[PDB]
């Protein structure tokens, strides 16, 4: 009844997973992860890559696949009682997104930042690259989409047309593929050194600012709460 600790899943699922990761690199950062031309890299680190990409395509196909088919067809008439329960679960999806972004855009990002300072890169595939770009980012993008779709398929208001701020919020993440990938790409001609002030990194900054579309998304979410028959009891009682 109402909004459960199905939420506690959402918070701990990343926390545990990513804390296992931080341990995992923590021990193989040094050991295998230093010299990429050693065969212990092609097993502890490269295989890790292929594993995750595959797992991501799959879970993405399953996760989006699931929700799009369990899209509520008879949305036209379902109670305000559930138009709340659902609105709340949607908010859990957003907490999961925001948490997922934290890890990607703050944690593993500025971590890679430190890593560059301490070893000259042997590949575009350092440990922290395997984790920052090809694990961390796909995850928060998948979470992103999930939420979007949940809202579109589960709640009226959001079922009517496309939310521009919500589209920007989930597509910005996805556009950071080359944006953050041009980091090392762009910086190679004029200056190969990974200077974060270089124009090559400006795409990451622009796509990072698309996270501010969360403000427009939350405004629309709270308007979906008010349309669903809420915000009138205690609001008027105030």
């Amino acid at each position: 009844l109402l909004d459960k600790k199905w939420l506690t899943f959402a918070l701990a699922i990343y926390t545990v997973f990513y804390l296992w990761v931080r341990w995992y690199e923590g021990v193989y950062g040094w050991s295998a992860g230093l010299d990429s031309f050693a065969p212990e890299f092609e097993t502890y680190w490269m295989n890790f890559l292929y594993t995750e990409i595959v797992l991501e395509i799959v879970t993405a196909s399953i996760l989006w696949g699931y929700l799009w088919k369990t899209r509520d067809r008879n949305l036209a008439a379902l109670t305000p009682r559930e138009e709340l329960r659902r609105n709340f679960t949607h908010l859990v999806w957003l907490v999961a997104y925001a948490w997922a972004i934290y890890w990607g855009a703050s944690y593993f990002t500025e971590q890679d930042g430190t890593w560059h300072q301490t070893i000259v890169r042997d590949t575009d595939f350092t440990p922290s690259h395997i984790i920052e770009f090809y694990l961390s980012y796909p995850i928060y993008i998948i979470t992103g989409f999930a939420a979007f779709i949940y809202a579109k398929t589960r709640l009226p208001f959001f079922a009517k047309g496309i939310s521009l701020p919500y589209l920007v919020l989930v597509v910005g993440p996805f556009m950071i593929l080359p944006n953050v990938g041009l980091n090392e790409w762009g910086h190679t001609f004029w200056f190969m050194e990974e200077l974060f002030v270089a124009p090559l990194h400006y795409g990451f900054v622009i796509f990072g600012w698309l996270a501010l579309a969360v403000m427009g998304t939350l405004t629309q979410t709270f308007y979906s709460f008010a349309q669903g028959g809420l915000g009138q009891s205690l609001c008027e009682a105030v």
Partner: protein
């Protein structure tokens, strides 16, 4: 670590490191290890690399597993960037204090301005002990002696916490009240402005005045303690003293130089011609940190990294003494797994198939002549 993946010809024709030496192979926390040697900036410096107008003498390690206590190019201490001059040879000396227990592959590298860390040979050095043992003491011109490991740590923390707390305090004050869906709607139908009132705007300026106040108080309080302070010292050191080398007595001419496709060896046809007056033999070809020796002629004692030293890697078609006045053409082959391991073989992907090295010649009584060669290096597949 980090060479290998970088362009093989960049590595051949950028900086040549030789007469490298390391005072110890195993060292206790807080102990010193001293790296010495020489480096030559190659006359045919690559276009893609800004000339070293502003270069920096760095150290190639996994972070501060050692701290650099001192560094010297020529006689001079080099904490800044420095202007090195193409063609010239210099002697450097890095002095490292050990800080983190472990096995470190320490390199000596150049921070070569516009594009490139120019990484020298790396040698494995082992630190034994506890990081908790490490001290980094420094005495100021101000009287006090401090430990750089922890100096000013608590201060940093305080001021960040304090300000952080105040940030929280501010959002905290507003968040005693409900935050979103009521305040949103109030703004909507009808006016807001019931949302904020007196008991609010007094606190607003409370904060505002309190903040400016604490900043200025704090600042001129920080000025009261610590009244003697300088700006960050910076700026490229010019006038680096280069090494005065005697004109070499041997001259060599590189006619064709080839490498086998899937291979581990580079052949070159040299005309060595011995001016000056003592029968000379060829003892080493140094190329990209990789050193190839004729052990019939020369033997490393400096403990040069084992993966880069090819003990009898270098074979000369005729390495008998070359008499003074005499001049001969000889076929030379530098061969060793290191050629594939450090990817000099990856020259086949480079846009400029030209190599560059140092040859070392030795006379009868064992004093040496260094000539430098460079030439196009051509693949052979069939």
């Amino acid at each position: 670590h980090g060479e290998k993946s970088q362009a093989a010809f960049m590595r051949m024709r950028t900086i040549h490191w030789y007469d490298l030496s390391w005072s110890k192979e195993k060292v206790k926390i807080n102990e010193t290890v001293e790296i010495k040697g020489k480096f030559h900036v190659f006359e045919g410096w690559p276009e893609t690399v800004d000339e070293p107008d502003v270069a920096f003498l760095n150290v190639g390690m996994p972070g501060p597993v050692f701290i650099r206590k001192e560094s010297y190019i020529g006689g001079q201490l080099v904490p800044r960037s420095v202007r090195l001059e193409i063609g010239k040879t210099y002697d450097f000396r890095v002095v490292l204090k050990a800080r983190r227990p472990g096995d470190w592959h320490v390199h000596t590298m150049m921070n070569v301005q516009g594009g490139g860390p120019i990484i020298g040979p790396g040698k494995w050095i082992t630190v034994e002990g506890s990081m908790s043992e490490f001290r980094n003491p420094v005495t100021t011109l101000t009287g006090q002696t401090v430990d750089l490991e922890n100096y000013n740590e608590g201060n940093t923390y305080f001021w960040h916490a304090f300000w952080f707390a105040i940030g929280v305090a501010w959002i905290g004050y507003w968040s005693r009240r409900p935050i979103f869906i009521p305040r949103l709607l109030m703004v909507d139908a009808g006016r807001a402005d019931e949302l904020v009132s007196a008991t609010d705007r007094k606190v607003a300026m409370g904060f505002l005045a309190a903040t400016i106040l604490i900043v200025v108080m704090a600042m001129s309080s920080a000025n009261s303690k610590y009244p003697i302070t300088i700006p960050l010292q910076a700026g490229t050191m010019r006038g680096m003293k280069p090494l005065e080398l005697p004109a070499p007595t041997v001259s060599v001419k590189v006619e064709d130089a080839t490498y086998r496709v899937p291979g581990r060896a580079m052949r070159m046809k040299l005309t060595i011609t011995n001016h000056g007056n003592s029968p000379i033999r060829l003892g080493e070809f140094y190329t990209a940190s990789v050193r190839f020796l004729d052990s019939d002629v020369y033997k490393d004692t400096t403990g040069y990294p084992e993966d880069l030293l090819a003990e009898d890697g270098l074979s000369v078609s005729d390495n008998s003494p070359l008499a003074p006045g005499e001049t001969r053409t000889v076929d030379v082959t530098a061969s060793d797994a290191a050629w594939e391991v450090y990817r000099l073989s990856d020259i086949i992907y480079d846009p400029d198939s030209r190599f560059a090295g140092l040859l070392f010649f030795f006379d009868a009584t064992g004093n040496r002549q260094v000539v430098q060669i460079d030439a196009p290096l051509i693949p052979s597949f069939m």
